[PDB]
Amino acid sequence: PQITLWKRPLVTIKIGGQLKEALLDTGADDTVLEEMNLPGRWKPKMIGGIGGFIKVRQYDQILIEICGHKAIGTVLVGPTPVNIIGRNLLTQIGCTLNF
Amino acid sequence: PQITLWKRPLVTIKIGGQLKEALLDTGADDTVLEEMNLPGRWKPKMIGGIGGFIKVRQYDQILIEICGHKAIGTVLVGPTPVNIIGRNLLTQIGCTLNF
Ligand SMILES: CC[C@H](C)CN(C[C@@H](O)[C@H](Cc1ccccc1)NC(=O)O[C@H]1CO[C@H]2OCC[C@H]21)S(=O)(=O)c1ccc([C@H](C)O)cc1
């Protein structure tokens, strides 16, 4: 589809058997999701943006479905105020910017 | 143009007569630029990102050309990690997400 940007580009995602709302965010290299207790091993990481850094847990090869489109890749889990779908997954669903 | 996301969507902008590089950021409501000199009056404002809140200078009705497309809108100036073009200006140049 085509999503205009009058409002935040929020979409439903499925990850770890849960449905959630997340931003399609061309400004994020990677994907960052609200605290959730995923199984498996993880690696600590610190990521920075406006206001400074937050601590997150890096999970690799996680299955995620973004508005019907399947993808698999790294997800960072931590105290983010919004779920952020980054370019690592936006490429996998064929998402582009156009003007 | 159509912009894929395997790389950061960085474009050249012109603001205040000077060229800069900026990131097309669909996850940003607002446009925030690193510290710079801009003519005209400004108002102190607060903005929140992934890591907390920062103080910025708000410039309204500022001419800014993005990848050859003209916009006139609000530009926030402050200690953002990188120059980001937010939805307030992406809508003006007709930018949409497509997949
Ligand atoms: C570096 C360029 C960007 C700043 C990077 N960010 C993406 C960016 O879209 C954030 C998303 C966001 C964050 C909090 C609340 C809403 C939306 N928007 C944002 O800050 O917008 C500001 C201005 O407009 C307002 O609207 C929303 C907030 C205000 S990040 O989240 O910090 C980030 C850093 C590192 C990684 C890993 C390492 O790749 C992934 C993501």
Find the DSSP H helices in B1-99. Answer: 87-90
Q: Do A77 and A33 contact (CB within 8 A), yes or no?
A: yes
CB atoms within 10 A of CB A76: 24
**B27: nearest CA partner in chain A:** A25
Q: Whose CA is nearest to atom 32 of ligand 1?
A: A49
Q: A13 near A64, Cβ under 8 Å?
A: yes
Helices (H) and strands (E) in chain B, counts: 1, 9
CATH architecture group of domain A1-99: Beta Barrel (2.40)
Beta bridge partners of A44: A57
Residue that has been written with the tokens 């910025």 in this structure: B56
Cβ-contact B50, A51 below 8 angstroms: yes
Residues of A in contact with B26 (CB under 8 A): 5, 9, 23-27, 97
Neighbours of A55 (CB within 10 A): 11
**CB distance B99 to A85 below 8 Å:** no
Sorted by where each begins, the domain ranges of chain A are 1-99
A90: left (phi over 0), alpha (psi -120 to 50) or beta: alpha
User: How were these coordinates obtained?
Assistant: X-ray
**Alpha-carbon span A66 to A19, nearest angstrom:** 10
Three-state DSSP class for B89?
Answer: helix
Q: Quote the ligand 1 centre to A49 CA distance (angstroms).
A: 6
Question: Distance of CA B71 to CAs A8, A37, A46, B84, B87, Å?
Answer: 19, 43, 35, 14, 12
Listed in sequence order, the residues at least 6 apart from A67 whose beta carbon sits closer than 8 Å to its beta carbon are A1, A11, A12, A13, A93
> Under 8 Å CB-to-CB from A72, ≥6 apart: which residues?
A61, A62, A63, A64, A92
- Do the chains contact at A27 and B29, CB–CB below 8 Å? no
Q: Which residues contact residue B7 at a Cβ distance below 8 angstroms, ignoring those fewer than 6 apart?
A: none
Rounded to the nearest whole angstrom, what is the distance from the C-alpha of residue A2 to the centroid of ligand 1?
Answer: 22
Residues from chain A that touch B51, judged by Cβ atoms under 8 A, are 48-54
Gyration radius (Cα) of chain A, Å: 13
How far is B45 from B6, CA to CA, in rounded Å? 34
Active site residue A30: no
Cα(B75)–Cα(B85) distance, rounded to whole angstroms? 9
Return residues 27-86 of B near A (CB < 8 Å): 27-29, 32, 47-54, 67, 69, 80-81, 84
Residues with CB under 6 A from ligand 1: A 25, 27-30, 32, 47, 49-50, 81-82, 84, 86; B 23, 25, 27-30, 32, 47-50, 81-82, 84, 86
